[PDB]
Structures are given as structure tokens and as C-alpha cells.
Amino acid sequence: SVKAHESVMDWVTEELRSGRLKIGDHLPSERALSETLGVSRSSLREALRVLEALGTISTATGSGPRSGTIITAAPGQALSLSVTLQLVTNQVGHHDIYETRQLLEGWAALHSSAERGDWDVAEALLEKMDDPSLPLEDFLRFDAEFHVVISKGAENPLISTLMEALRLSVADHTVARARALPDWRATSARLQKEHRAILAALRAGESTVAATLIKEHIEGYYEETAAAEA
Amino acid sequence: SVKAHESVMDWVTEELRSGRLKIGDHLPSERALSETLGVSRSSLREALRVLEALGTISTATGSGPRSGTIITAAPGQALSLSVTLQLVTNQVGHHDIYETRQLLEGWAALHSSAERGDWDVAEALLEKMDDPSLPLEDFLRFDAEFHVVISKGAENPLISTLMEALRLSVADHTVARARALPDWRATSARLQKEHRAILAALRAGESTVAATLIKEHIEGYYEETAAAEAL
């Protein structure tokens, strides 16, 4: 219930604040927590089931004696589901998603610091993406992941969380745009070349160059799929 | 039921695509849906309660759950729950929230249309915020809502979606920093004047003026609280 939900949020918040608990730690059993909060065991399980679906909480099987309910504090898919659902209606269009990426990625690139980038993780993603047999959908899923990873160079975790939360809707968007592409082989090749030149600029600390390349990369794909007609 | 969730999402998506239902419309009954989707009544209800939490649907219109459930396709509070928990553990800092607001709010104002924002609604928020007997928690709660309201004036609707998803965290953020303010009466006074001017610029189509004022507004409060910290 609401009472249970808020009681839990306030409780977890205070545990994290005091240091008694840390992200990744297991919560007390439902029996114990429900008594501590003064709420029915039923309303507590429901509140936790919802928090689990949202990503705030996560469950690990086989944890006994530990509860198996972990404080993860992940944004979940709510934001992506809202973006993608709105996209179906006249309320939101592909260009709106495209432009959102430009705003966020542009800011991250502009403020990127070479010593802060998880460059090896990003380059590995690009490694899997060169696989000639790799399906169009998987390639674009890694593509969106790659863009989230390189945005970490700006070391702004909130911006990074927003990027991660939008990841699913970004892939949904590029995948749909790709449907009308005449030659995915050639397109993915150019995208890969651009991805590496972007990563190189970021590695060299050429923030302004990286930002320009990212802008041209995202816009290039958007215009290309528009021409293909989709 | 993970299938109940998928079955419902797929159903809602198609109703929206076909045009039979649009954002804001009511869902049919659970009895009707349970059958149509081939999912137990209990599993269907579990999925709907999650969809409600996700922001996809809502039963808080008319007179509450009694008035039914409508399709909202909104962000919900998930991201804010995440952000505020990370804020508490220092995984995310006040500084990060500040930079993010400047980015999102500035763009929304810079690229807005006077015919797009519901200024009277925003104006009404500022009227409640005028009350000198209003505690700072409530004031700042309305403050965050106000900023989300004016962001809907942006040509890109998604900016307001991101703003809405961040709303509760922004409020948590500003309230936390206000506590240390040596003179809240004076502070809230300058914020209202600044809010009015911002709303005035936007209402008049002065996108560039609005964006500059929002930058100074958000920056002003951040530095002021950054100084008012007891230490």
C-alpha cells in the first residue's frame, strides 16, 4: 500500500543515510521489517513487489539466511516505457527522442574528461559490434549501451543514470528507424567507424571534437533512415 | 505474472496505435481484460498495480480509484526513487542534480513556444507559494512542480517527461539544501519574484530571456545554499 511504500522508502532512506545499510545490502526479512514499520505483512510484501518491479529493489535467489531482497536503487524501465508508449501516439515523435539524445550526449561529451572515461569497456562493446553475423537488433542494443558508457566521461552520475534509463527506448527507436535501411551492412560499418573516431577524440581529451562527431553521428543516422524513408 | 505485464503492455500499445484509445482514456474493466488477455484476475491486478507505479496508468482522476483507471504513459517516480537514494549515499551529489537541471530547464525555456505552455496553471502554483505561512517543504514541493509545468512549453515534449521523472528528486534536493538558509523568508521572496519574471518571459515568447533567467534562478539558489551550509 501507500503507507507501506512510504514507510519503506523513509526507512531505507534513513538506513542508507546513517550508514547502517549500503546499496547492495540485504533488507531484514519481511516479518521483521513489517513489525519495525508497523504495517501488515501483506501491505509490506506488495510494496516490495512494486519496488522490485521498479528497480529500486532487487531480489537474489538462493540467499538464505539473508532475505534476498536487495537495495539496488536502479531507475528501472519506467522512463523508457513512458517514452516508447508516448511515441506510439501523436504526442511524441522520433525526432523528439533523437533530439533528447543530442541534448544529453552533447552535454556529456562537452564536459568529458579523458582520465574519467571507461574507455576499455566502451571499446569492448564496439568489439562485439564488429561481428559480421551480429543481428541488426543486437547491434543497436549495444550501440545504445556504448553511448551510455562514453557519457560517463563527464562524471555526472545523474546524467549517466538518465542515459541508462533511456537506453531501451533509444534502441527501440533506432531499430525501428533501421527497418527501411537498404544496406545495413554498409550502414553499420560507417556507424562503427564513427563510433571509434568518437572514442578516439574522447580518449585524447578532444571534448569539442568528440561533441561535434557525436552530433554528426546521431544526426547522420537519423537523416539516413529518414531518406531510406522511415 | 510477468506475462500479465507483457500482455497488458502489448494490449495498451495496440489500442493506442489503432486509435481506439488515446492517452487520458479509461481502460475497460478488469473482468473484461482478464478474459481478453487470458490471464488470471489476480495476476492481472498485480500487473496493473505495477503499471500504476511505473506511471503507465493511473487511478487518481475523477474521484480516485472509484472513477476508474486511465492511460497516462507517464514516467512515475522510479527514477526519482533511484536518484534520491543515490543522493543519500553520495553516489549522486547535489552538484549533479544542479548541472542536470540547468541543462534540461535551460533548453526547455530556450526552445519553447508561448502557445504551448499552460501558464495559468503555473501562475496558480505561484499563488499558493505566496503564502507567508507556507512551510518551506511545501513551498519547494510546489517549486519543483512549477518548473515541470513550464517545461511543457518546450517544443520537445520529452524534456518535460524527463523533468517529471526528476520532480520529486529536485524537491528532495532543494529542501535538503534549504534547511541551512539563515534567512528563508528573504530567500523565498527572491525566488517568487524570479519565478514571476520567468513565467512572464515565457508567456511573452521571450525564450532567450526566460532561459537566462532560469540559469540565474537555479544558479542563484544553488550558490546561496552552498554558502549557507553550516560549515
Ligand SMILES: [Zn+2]
Ligand atoms: Zn551510435
Ligand SMILES: [Zn+2]
Ligand atoms: Zn524555482
